[PDB]
A paper describes a structure:
AMPARs mediate fast excitatory signaling in the brain, and a change in their number or function underlies lasting forms of synaptic plasticity. Following glutamate binding, closure of the LBD clamshell around the agonist causes separation of the D2 domains, applying tension to linkers between the LBDs and the ion channel which opens the gate.
Thus we compared S729C, cross-linking of which permits the relaxed dimer conformation, with G724C which we predicted would not accommodate the relaxed dimer conformation when cross-linked. Instead they displayed a non-biological conformation, with a large rotation and total loss of the dimer interface which cannot be accommodated within the intact receptor. By contrast, functional cross-linking of a different mutant GluA2(R) G724C/γ-2—which did not assume a relaxed LBD dimer when crystallized—trapped these receptors in a non-conducting state, indicating that this conformation must be distinct from that of native desensitized AMPARs.
Author numbering:
A (entry chain B): 4 to 264
B (entry chain A): 4 to 262
Write the structure that this text describes.
């Protein structure tokens, strides 16, 4: 029985090679999560097929219908057997899916144009001439909606109120918004992606110092999945061997295009 | 009549214009604290004269001799009526002079050459092949001297004992030492100046994220000065009016060469 792996196009976790138009199957994709998916399949011993999430979203729950979208949705409604993507382990998501122990750490961070007069999240709260927003349906927006910190709650109010909408449908759109906005838009995105983009051309982006919290990515499986335990202890057997850190160094910093390292 | 303002050459707070040799008086100087001095004098309503501290130091107290040097020294001994400079508000200085409320926040930070394998102050404490030092007579040196945190005390011991001299007499000397040291010297300086240098050519210096503490700059006046209240309410009306942030952005980022 073939295993259907649900994932999302997100640099550097899953990208499509240049020759991806003359290729088929799993040989079209490249990144941290494709290799991680391969090695996970080797340790567990199942053949798998890479699928991109249909709606292109990570996973949020409608307040009124209590329905789920994105990869979490595709797991709850039996559209995929396992999710191998930068999917943050959150309390709400744990209600409907199972998470392995974190295979990578991260935290919400700010991304600005190099040379911009911003130095903190509280600075963002005070000012108004620079806009800032969040991904459309991800751990970040959920964090700001349910946050009780005064600064974070204020930022949330501004974002929900500020129009022309400050939110974005894909992180790429956010980074592009920052780069084109001539330092008038700052993007709130997870630290890993911020660092990655920071170390790649045109080298005009900067990560502000300070993570707003500390979470991690986990391997998600449907509640009651026969594959849950195997992958859950598998990622630990890969952490002991240190291959996860070798992958991080492989895709983030071993080939940094900007300045120095 | 005229009030003598004591200050210090420290970019971008007080600098000398590109010409300045074709100018005289207060029109030779430029920076954050020159403008702040202008607005303070406007709100209070006094004509002032800008003077650079004679010994070129901020302010420390000899343990045995007591006595003060730098701008604080010039304030205690009636050599100047007010000090408008990046002068950190500390308890010891507050014992002998008066400080307005902070017009700018800051914290001790590390400055490295871009491409250096350092990520924290504790990393510096553990290793020994990379040197690190501080300004000679400022809030930073006193911070490391009177710190009881294990790492900070260890760094202090290293700096004071191991000396191919690691200290510097002016911030410029520190930044130059970092740039020339090929990533083998890291400079411990307040975060604000580190950010400024980070935003100026040749764009080869970097500020580590971890700040070692959190303090602020205040306008200093001698104990019992008639100008204390006036300047305090001036800086409060300028923080309320928001001009301080416009000045920070003006001198740090409005003319950033590294981006
Ligand atoms: N990895 C996050 C994406 C949200 C973000 O980048 O802020 C998630 O699982 O939803
Ligand atoms: N500005 C500091 C000195 C600079 C430093 O120690 O980094 C003071 O008021 O003493």
């Amino acid at each position: 029985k073939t295993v259907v792996v649900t994932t999302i196009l997100e640099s550097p976790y899953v990208m499509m090679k240049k020759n991806h138009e003359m290729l088929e199957g799993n040989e079209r994709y490249e990144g941290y999560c494709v290799d991680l998916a391969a090695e996970i399949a080797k340790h567990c011993g199942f053949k798998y097929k890479l699928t991109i999430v249909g709606d292109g979203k990570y996973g949020a729950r409608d307040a009124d219908t209590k329905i789920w979208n994105g990869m979490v949705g595709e797991l709850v409604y039996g559209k995929a057997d396992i999710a191998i993507a930068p999917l943050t382990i959150t309390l709400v998501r744990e209600e409907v899916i199972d998470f392995s122990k974190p295979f990578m750490s991260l935290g919400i961070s700010i991304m600005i144009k190099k040379g911009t007069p911003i130095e903190s999240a509280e600075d963002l709260s005070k000012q108004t001439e620079i806009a800032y927003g969040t991904l459309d349906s991800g751990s970040t927006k959920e964090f700001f909606r349910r946050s009780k910190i005064a600064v974070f709650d204020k930022m949330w109010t501004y974002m929900r109120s500020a129009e022309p909408s400050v939110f974005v449908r894909t992180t790429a759109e956010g980074v592009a918004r920052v780069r084109k906005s001539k330092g008038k838009y700052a993007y709130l995105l997870e630290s890993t992606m911020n660092e990655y983009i920071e170390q790649r051309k045109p080298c005009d982006t900067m990560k502000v110092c300070g993570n707003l919290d500390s979470k991690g990515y986990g391997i998600a499986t449907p509640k009651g999945s026969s594959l849950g335990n195997a992958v859950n202890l598998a990622v630990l057997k890969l952490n002991e061997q240190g291959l996860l850190d070798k992958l991080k160094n492989k895709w983030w910093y071993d080939k940094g295009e900007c300045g120095s390292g």
